[PDB]
Amino acid sequence: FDRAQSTIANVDPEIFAAIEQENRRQEDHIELIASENYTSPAVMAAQGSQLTNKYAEGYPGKRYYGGCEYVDVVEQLAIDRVKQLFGAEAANVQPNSGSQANQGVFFAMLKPGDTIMGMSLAHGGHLTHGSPVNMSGKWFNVVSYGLNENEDIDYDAAEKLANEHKPKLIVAGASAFALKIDFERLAKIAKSVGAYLMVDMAHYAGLIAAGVYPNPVPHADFVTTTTHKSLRGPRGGVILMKAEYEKPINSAIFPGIQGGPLMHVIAAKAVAFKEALSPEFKEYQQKVVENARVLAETLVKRGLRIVSGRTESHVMLVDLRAKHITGKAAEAALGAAHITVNKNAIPNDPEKPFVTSGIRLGSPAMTTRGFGPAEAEQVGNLIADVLENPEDAATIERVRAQVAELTKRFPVYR
Amino acid sequence: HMFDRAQSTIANVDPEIFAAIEQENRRQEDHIELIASENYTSPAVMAAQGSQLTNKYAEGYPGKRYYGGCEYVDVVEQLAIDRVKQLFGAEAANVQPNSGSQANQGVFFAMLKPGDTIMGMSLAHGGHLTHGSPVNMSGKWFNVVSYGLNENEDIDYDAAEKLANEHKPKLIVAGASAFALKIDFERLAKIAKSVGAYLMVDMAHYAGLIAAGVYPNPVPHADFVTTTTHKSLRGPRGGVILMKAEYEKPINSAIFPGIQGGPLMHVIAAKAVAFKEALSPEFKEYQQKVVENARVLAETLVKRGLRIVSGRTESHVMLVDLRAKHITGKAAEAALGAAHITVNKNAIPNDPEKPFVTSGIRLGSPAMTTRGFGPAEAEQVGNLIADVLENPEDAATIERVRAQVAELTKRFPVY
Ligand SMILES: Cc1ncc(COP(=O)(O)O)c(CN[C@@H](CO)C(=O)O)c1O
Numbered sequence: 001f002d003r004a005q006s007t008i009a010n011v012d013p014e015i016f017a018a019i020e021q022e023n024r025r026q027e028d029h030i031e032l033i034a035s036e037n038y039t040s041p042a043v044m045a046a047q048g049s050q051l052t053n054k055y056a057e058g059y060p061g062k063r064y065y066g067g068c069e070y071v072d073v074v075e076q077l078a079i080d081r082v083k084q085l086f087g088a089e090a091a092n093v094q095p096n097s098g099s100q101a102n103q104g105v106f107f108a109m110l111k112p113g114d115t116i117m118g119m120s121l122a123h124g125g126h127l128t129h130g131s132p133v134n135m136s137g138k139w140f141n142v143v144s145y146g147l148n149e150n151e152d153i154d155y156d157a158a159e160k161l162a163n164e165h166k167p168k169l170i171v172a173g174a175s176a177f178a179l180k181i182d183f184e185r186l187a188k189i190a191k192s193v194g195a196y197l198m199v200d201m202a203h204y205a206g207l208i209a210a211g212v213y214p215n216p217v218p219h220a221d222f223v224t225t226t227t228h229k230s231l232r233g234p235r236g237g238v239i240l241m242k243a244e245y246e247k248p249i250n251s252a253i254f255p256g257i258q259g260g261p262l263m264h265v266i267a268a269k270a271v272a273f274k275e276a277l278s279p280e281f282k283e284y285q286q287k288v289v290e291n292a293r294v295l296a297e298t299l300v301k302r303g304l305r306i307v308s309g310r311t312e313s314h315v316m317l318v319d320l321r322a323k324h325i326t327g328k329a330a331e332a333a334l335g336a337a338h339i340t341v342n343k344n345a346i347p348n349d350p351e352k353p354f355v356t357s358g359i360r361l362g363s364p365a366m367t368t369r370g371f372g373p374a375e376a377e378q379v380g381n382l383i384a385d386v387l388e389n390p391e392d393a394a395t396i397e398r399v400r401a402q403v404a405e406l407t408k409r410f411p412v413y414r
Numbered sequence: 415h416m417f418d419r420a421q422s423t424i425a426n427v428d429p430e431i432f433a434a435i436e437q438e439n440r441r442q443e444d445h446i447e448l449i450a451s452e453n454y455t456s457p458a459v460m461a462a463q464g465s466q467l468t469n470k471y472a473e474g475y476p477g478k479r480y481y482g483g484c485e486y487v488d489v490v491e492q493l494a495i496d497r498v499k500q501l502f503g504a505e506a507a508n509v510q511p512n513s514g515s516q517a518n519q520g521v522f523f524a525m526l527k528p529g530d531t532i533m534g535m536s537l538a539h540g541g542h543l544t545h546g547s548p549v550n551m552s553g554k555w556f557n558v559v560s561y562g563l564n565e566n567e568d569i570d571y572d573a574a575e576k577l578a579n580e581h582k583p584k585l586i587v588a589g590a591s592a593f594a595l596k597i598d599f600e601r602l603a604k605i606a607k608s609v610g611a612y613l614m615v616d617m618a619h620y621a622g623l624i625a626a627g628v629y630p631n632p633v634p635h636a637d638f639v640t641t642t643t644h645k646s647l648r649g650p651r652g653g654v655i656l657m658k659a660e661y662e663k664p665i666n667s668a669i670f671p672g673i674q675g676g677p678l679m680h681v682i683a684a685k686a687v688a689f690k691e692a693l694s695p696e697f698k699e700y701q702q703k704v705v706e707n708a709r710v711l712a713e714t715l716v717k718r719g720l721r722i723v724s725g726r727t728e729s730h731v732m733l734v735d736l737r738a739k740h741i742t743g744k745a746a747e748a749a750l751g752a753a754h755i756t757v758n759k760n761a762i763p764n765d766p767e768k769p770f771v772t773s774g775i776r777l778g779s780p781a782m783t784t785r786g787f788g789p790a791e792a793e794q795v796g797n798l799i800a801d802v803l804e805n806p807e808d809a810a811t812i813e814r815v816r817a818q819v820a821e822l823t824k825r826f827p828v829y
Contacts (some may be wrong), residue, residue, distance in 0.1 A: 001829050006457035012687045014493060019465050019683060022486040026466055029483060038470055041422035048464015048678075049435050050442055050829070052651050053642070055452050065449060065758055066751045070438040075431060096512035099675045112555055120441055133671050139528055228468070235468050235678050253551035255543050255550050259515045262651050264463075267431055274428045280416065335482045368417070413466070414418045 004399045027412055030379060030403055034315040034362025035175070035203065037232045038369060038412050040275060043268045047234050051264035053279050057254060061381030071263045076265050081273035085209045088240035093255050093269055094261040098202050098226035102128040103135060104239055105198050105222045108252035112139045117162060117195070118171035119153070120144035124317070125345055126175040126200060143167060147347055151308040153177075155185050162193045172216070173200030173224075176344055176360050178296075180214050180310045187219040198222040204313060206230030206364070209276045210285035213313055221245060230288065230314055231366050232281075233272025236265050284367065288314050291376040292363040298380025304387070307346055307358070315362045322411035323387045327356035333390035334359075337399040338407075339383060345369055370410040378406070430628050441816040443828055445754045446819055450731040450778020451591070451619065453648045454785060454828050456691065459684045460592070463650050466471055467680035473670060487679045494682050497689035501625045502633045504656035509685055510669050510677040511653030514618050514642035518544040519551060521614050521638045523666035526584060526594055528555045533578060533611070534587035535569075536560035539763055540733070542591040543615060558710060559583060563763055569593075571601050578609045588632070589616030589640075592776050594712075594727035596630055603635035614638040620729060622646030622780070625692050626701035629729055637661060645729055646704070646780050648697075649688025652681050700783065707792040708779040714796025720803070723762055723774070731778045735762050739803045743772030749806035750775075753815040755799060755821075784827040 008016040026038070051071060053264040057064045060072040060079075095101035110116070116136070119125030123146035127134045130142035143165045145158035162170065170190045172181060183199060190197040199216035205214035205225040216223050223240040227233035241249045254261070275281055290310075296311045299318060307317035320330055327343030334341050345351075346358040363371075366379065382399050389395040425432040442454070467487060473480045476488040476495075485688035494509040511517035526532070534552070535541030543550045546558035559581045564570035578586065588597060591747045597614060606613040616634035621641040623629035632639050639656040643649035657665045670677070691697060705728075710723050712732045723733035731765055736746055743759030752759050760776040767773050777799075779792065787795070798815050805811040 001454075001457065003457045004827075006461075008458050008687065011456065012462075012690045013456035014545060015462065015490060015683055015686050015690070018486050018489040018493075019462070019467060021469065021489075023466055025483060025486060026469060033471060033481060036469065037419065038466075038469055040416055040426035040427065041419045042424050044464050044466065044468060045422075045424050046431065046435070048427075048458065048460050050439050050454075051435060052460060053442060053452060053454055053789050054438070055449060066747060067441060067447075067756050069442060070434050073434040073437075077434075086524065096516065097675055097678075099673065100512065100516070103673070127671050127675065131671065134669070135523060135673050138672075213732070235676070235680075251549070255547065255549050256554075257519070259513055259543065260651065264651075267435060270431050271424065271428045274415070274431070280711065302625070318807060331482060340481075340483050413415065414415065414420075 028407055029338045029340050029405060031365040032116060032361045034360050034364070035229050036231060037234055037364045039228065041235060041413070043234050043271045044269035046262045046271045049126060049264050051267050054263050055260045056263050057260050059250060061288050064256065074267045074270055077105050078270040078273060081270060081277060082240070084274060085217060085276055086223070086240055088217050088223070088229060089243040090241050090246040092239040092253050094258060094265055095239060096233070096258060096262065098224065098237045099128050101224040101237030101239050102200060103257055104249060104252045105224060106136065108245070108248040109196055110140065113141060113164055114168045115141040115143060116169045116171060117143050117145060117158070117165070117167040119174050120146045123147045124174040124176035126173070129171045129173070129200065134331065151347055152179055153181060155189070158186070159189050159264060162189050163194065166193055167195050169196040169198055171198050171200060173202065175203060176315065176317050178306070178308050178313055180312045183214060183216040183219040197219045198224065200224050202226040203229055203315060206232055206276065206287050207289065207314060210282040212289050217298050222249070227269050227272060230285070231272060232364070232368065234265050234268035235331065236262070236269060238269070240246055242336050260347055287372070288363050288367045290373060291367050291371060292316060294373045294376040295361060295363060295380045298377045299384060302381065302384035304384065314364050316361065317344055317346060318359050318361060319357060320359065320387065321357055325387055325390055326351055327358050328354065329390060330387060333386050333396070334383065337382070337386050337396050338403040339365060339386070369412045375406060375410070439829070444820070444823055445756050446823065447756045447781040448777045449512060449758055450758055450776050450780070451645050452475040452778045453645060455644065455648055455650060455688065455794060458790060459650055459687050462684035462687050463680045465680050469771060470679050471676045472679050473676050475666060490679060490683045490686055494686035497686060497693065498654055498656070500632065501689055501692055502639070502656055504633050504639065506657050506662040508655040508665055508669050509682055510674060512674060512678065513651070514640065514653045515544050516674065517640040517653030517655050518616060519673055520665065520668045521640060521656055522552065523672045524661070524664040525612055526556065529557060530584045531557040531559065531581055532585045532587060533559050533561060533574070533581070533583040535590055536562040538761060539563045540590040540592035541687045542589070545587045545589070547651060550596065556611065567763055568595055569597060571598065571605070574602070575605045576603050576609065582609055585612040585614060587614050589618060592731065592733050594722070594724050594729055596728045596734050599630060599632040599635040612637045615642065616640045618642040619645055619731060622648055622692065623701050623705065623730060626698040628701050628705050638665070643652070643685050646701070647692060648784065650681050650684035652678070652685060654685070703788065704779050706785045706789060707783050708732060709779060710789045710792040711779060711780060711796045714793045715800060716747060718797065718800035720800065725800050730780050731776065733760055733762060734774065734775050735773060736775060736803065737773050741803055741806055743774045744770070745806055746775050746803060749802050749812070750799065753798070753812050754819045755802070755804050782793070786829045791822060791826070
């Protein structure tokens with residue numbers, strides 16, 4: 001309890017060693033998982049603070065425990081900054097995760113058995129948007145909408161489904177969709193059947209904050225997000241809501257589905273929001289969008305296909321059929337070449353769900369460590385090299401060596 | 415640069431947050447903390463959840479992840495699982511729950527369907543929010559039957575048995591947020607078995623005492639045992655589920671993909687560190703002092719004319735009946751807080767006051783024991799509390815106590 005003696009290395013050598021290896025792994029691999037980023041030392045320092053010691057059930061100025069004057073300052077800063085970031089009427093920064101943020105809306109507005117609409121998992125929707133093995137799909141009646149022939153969201157079909165099934169709530173947002181979503185149109189659809197509109201902007205949140213992806217907040221009743229993806233913050237969730245839903249949302253998070261908030265993580269959220277308000281962050285996201293486009297363009301030049309035909313965001317779904325390789329095989333081969341991606345089903349995938357014909361790629365992480373258009377293009381070409389000969393030892397090695405050059409030249413943490 | 419560890423300090427990036435954390439650091443030093451659910455976790459634990467492991471998406475379980483590159487977070491999580499199994503002798507464990515509430519929700523999601531009947535200890539008598547409160551998920555989406563204390567303010571096992579037979583709960587919850595005595599988990603297991611119900615024990619408050627062997631272990635008797643890692647266990651903020659091997663698959667499926675997504679791997683690393691610390695002989699010695707200090711505190715307050723619910727404590731915690739000094743729980747909390755003693759108000763059985771007022775305060779010894787308080791200090795603290803309670807609005811009294819608190823806090827620094 002002098003920070004000198006209680007180090008991880010002294011107290012728990014096994015865990016220290018494992019953490020050290022993860023540090024090096026983060027340096028030594030090019031990360032293209034669209035949901036991952038590298039958060040700042042300041043953010044990490046914040047959730048490594050003594051604020052973990054405080055029980056603070058309730059909300060600023062209305063706590064159940066005494067001694068909360070300073071954690072109140074922290075939480076209110078987090079609330080005010082995130083409201084400022086997205087122009088929200090109200091906010092809740094206590095959700096433990098993106099899942100809990102989404103569960104909070106559901107607990108606030110719905111009863112078990114209610115009908116909801118969400119984007120289908122097969123076409124890029126998330127687990128929490130109605131999967132039958134998730135709470136959202138097991139305890140509720142789920143109707144899903146998907147993509148059209150152009151692999152854009154099929155707004156007409158969604159409208160038809162809404163009228164047919166009369167959902168109490170409509171979910172929009174996605175984990176693997178490259179285009180701009182028309183939140184205004186989904187809002188009209190929701191209003192026309194008297195449904196709530198909830199937008200899960202977890203993946204796009206950083207882009208939205210920087211103004212390079214459309215903002216769902218003026219159109220939706222509820223907007224949920226993670227703080228750790230494109231927002232580049234700590235791991236956790238946030239709910240944004242219209243003022244009229246402030247009381248049900250706050251009551252749903254506590255005492256509804258959570259207990260004591262993680263005040264150290266909320267402090268870390270506040271720091272990330274401060275960073276997101278800066279001109280440097282806007283410039284970062286402009287580069288994120290640029291690098292994603294260049295990556296997509298490069299893969300197309302090498303004969304691959306991009307689902308929806310283009311990206312208008314940080315993310316892309318790559319159709320691998322022209323190179324006669326499965327997503328599963330592609331993920332494995334790229335991983336061996338020190339490029340981290342994940343397999344992902346494409347629309348009308350001829351392969352089994354655990355195999356797939358696609359991979360999802362994203363630019364936030366590589367952009368954070370300093371990659372520009374030249375590097376994004378180089379990475380595109382390296383991926384294609386692997387895909388065209390995934391089991392050739394010499395091919396994997398040549399790429400790995402070039403990956404090593406990039407990662408050494410662009411360190412994550414200095 | 416934004417990712418240079420020299421330049422990216424909290425003070426450099428965010429001076430306002432720096433200032434608030436600094437004030438909180440000093441607040442933790444300058445107050446005697448007697449909130450029974452709070453502790454001071456080690457720098458090693460804090461360092462772990464301040465690590466780069468926050469950057470990793472690791473949906474799934476060790477060796478069965480959906481993402482690549484999880485080799486090292488797998489080592490971390492498996493160490494956490496193996497150590498917590500070792501601490502409590504559990505057949506299986508899940509260390510991903512984001513909180514105690516999510517731990518409890520995980521069991522419910524695994525074993526129950528909305529509308530099912532459950533039994534839990536009543537909130538009025540020391541049960542927790544997640545044990546069937548109608549404003550909590552546990553009580554709003556399920557049919558709740560609650561059991562409480564008897565005339566001696568011990569758990570009324572006979573009444574619980576009658577209720578179980580009458581209502582046929584699918585699941586019985588045991589454990590408490592404010593109960594001083596040893597709970598008879600074996601008897602509750604028998605009652606549960608007799609009606610074919612699952613037994614879930616929420617040992618959040620007692621977990622550290624149980625690990626050190628100074629409070630009875632529910633693991634050999636229960637189907638499921640849930641806990642927080644931040645209370646008497648003295649770890650990071652988060653949850654854990656312990657379960658019999660036969661329930662390994664439904665429990666793991668319930669946490670993911672059931673109710674959570676990517677686990678907080680940095681926090682799980684911190685959990686692992688906390689479990690390593692808990693396995694040491696020093697931790698057992700700590701919990702012996704916790705139990706001793708709680709007893710001494712209780713005895714001292716009784717000497718000053720207060721009453722302890724259940725008549726004694728056999729743990730870290732006590733509920734103090736304040737009526738003899740004609741002061742409410744709310745007023746007591748406020749007055750003690752001004753004297754730099756942190757407590758929280760709490761209803762007593764058959765409390766004549768409104769729920770927001772109460773006639774009691776809950777006290778615990780884990781935090782003060784952690785910063786080094788012994789029996790002499792525990793007794794002194796008991797007397798200081800009584801001094802405030804007997805004259806809660808006297809400025810001179812508040813000042814004298816505050817001065818003595820300052821002497822103690824200076825003598826026993828936390829960090
Ligand atoms: C759109 C969206 N919404 C919620 C979540 C879950 O948040 P957690 O903090 O992990 O609970 C996600 C998470 N996405 C992961 C896994 O599906 C991803 O790689 O996209 C999400 O995308």
